[PDB]
Scaffold this active site. Sequence first.
Site, PDB file in Angstrom:
ATOM      1  N   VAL A 207       0.854  -1.182   0.000  1.00  6.64           N
ATOM      2  CA  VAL A 207       0.000   0.000   0.000  1.00  6.64           C
ATOM      3  C   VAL A 207       0.890   1.233   0.000  1.00  6.64           C
ATOM      4  O   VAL A 207       1.847   1.317   0.780  1.00  6.64           O
ATOM      5  CB  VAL A 207      -0.959   0.022   1.206  1.00  6.64           C
TER       6      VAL A 207
ATOM      7  N   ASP B 209     -11.195  -9.536   9.027  1.00  7.53           N
ATOM      8  CA  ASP B 209      -9.822  -9.372   9.509  1.00  7.53           C
ATOM      9  C   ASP B 209      -9.633  -8.042  10.233  1.00  7.53           C
ATOM     10  O   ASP B 209      -8.632  -7.340  10.037  1.00  7.53           O
ATOM     11  CB  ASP B 209      -8.790  -9.633   8.406  1.00  7.53           C
TER      12      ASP B 209
ATOM     13  N   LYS C 229      -8.468  -5.404  12.781  1.00  6.43           N
ATOM     14  CA  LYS C 229      -7.410  -5.231  13.758  1.00  6.43           C
ATOM     15  C   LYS C 229      -7.120  -3.750  13.863  1.00  6.43           C
ATOM     16  O   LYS C 229      -7.500  -2.985  12.967  1.00  6.43           O
ATOM     17  CB  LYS C 229      -6.159  -6.037  13.381  1.00  6.43           C
ATOM     18  N   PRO C 230      -6.492  -3.307  14.957  1.00  2.00           N
ATOM     19  CA  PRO C 230      -6.298  -1.860  15.161  1.00  2.00           C
ATOM     20  C   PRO C 230      -5.629  -1.153  13.999  1.00  2.00           C
ATOM     21  O   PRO C 230      -5.949   0.013  13.702  1.00  2.00           O
ATOM     22  CB  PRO C 230      -5.418  -1.830  16.419  1.00  2.00           C
TER      23      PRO C 230
ATOM     24  N   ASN D  84      -5.974  -1.650  10.894  1.00  2.00           N
ATOM     25  CA  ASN D  84      -6.916  -1.436   9.791  1.00  2.00           C
ATOM     26  C   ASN D  84      -8.016  -0.440  10.139  1.00  2.00           C
ATOM     27  O   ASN D  84      -8.983  -0.314   9.378  1.00  2.00           O
ATOM     28  CB  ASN D  84      -7.625  -2.738   9.390  1.00  2.00           C
TER      29      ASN D  84
END
Length: 266
Positions: A11, A106, A108-109, A111
């Site tokens: 990314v 999925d 999670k912090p 994301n």
Amino acid sequence: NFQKVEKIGVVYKARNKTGEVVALKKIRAIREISLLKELNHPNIVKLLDVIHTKLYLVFEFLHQDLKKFMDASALTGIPLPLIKSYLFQLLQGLAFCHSHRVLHRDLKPQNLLINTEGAIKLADFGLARAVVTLWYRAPEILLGCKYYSTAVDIWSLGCIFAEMVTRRALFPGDSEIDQLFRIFRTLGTPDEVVWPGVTSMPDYKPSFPKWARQDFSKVVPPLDEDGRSLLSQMLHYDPNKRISAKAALAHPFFQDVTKPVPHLRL
Ligand SMILES: COC(=O)c1ccc(NCCc2c[nH]c3ccccc23)c(C(=O)O)c1
């Protein structure tokens, strides 16, 4: 077409040669993903373009994520009103995507993206199938359930809620069985009483150790009974008993919810 700014598949922060700053994902179906461009919600990161030529996904850009913010806030902790606003907003985002039959899978912090105006948004959906971090994985996934429900996202969000409160990961496992056993040691080894059908799960073993259940007063101590009650409903073993995003929004924990603005160092 894009001037790469920094590495955020892979990314990048990139600038459209429109001047717009975006998050560009190079992935290395096409019809299904394109539908998401026109489904939009304030608490979901916007998907701007889909390009296949190698698959590129272009998203709106946000400067910080909840993992970085939690680390920056670890000496003091995130203020409870901000924890509550973020939880409420993430549940609004999940209620929207689940109402359109889209799972995240999925959460999670890292994301969960935040801005200077107090918003938080769901990003990095695990929609491809439709070190790996297992700390937020629902127990039915770890036990080999072939078909996820919306409940997997509520579990992950409950784990994140606990982590924002206590400033430590709830279940930081490093293998699938270590993750499962960390869950079992805290919440008790599940049985047919609390989770009908658990003993039929593909990866369930009768030889699993039988741990007793601890108390939530020990698990997220500082949190009041409204928050502990909501967390307990988000962490029910039985996916059919686990609270939905819509129902969680009505929980008394949110009666005094507000939208504070965080202190962000960019
Ligand atoms: C191989 O990767 C992929 O196919 C893929 C597809 C979609 C993705 N996000 C979609 C965000 C979104 C925008 N509007 C929504 C409405 C409801 C639910 C989710 C959304 C991502 C990602 O977030 O990385 C990856």
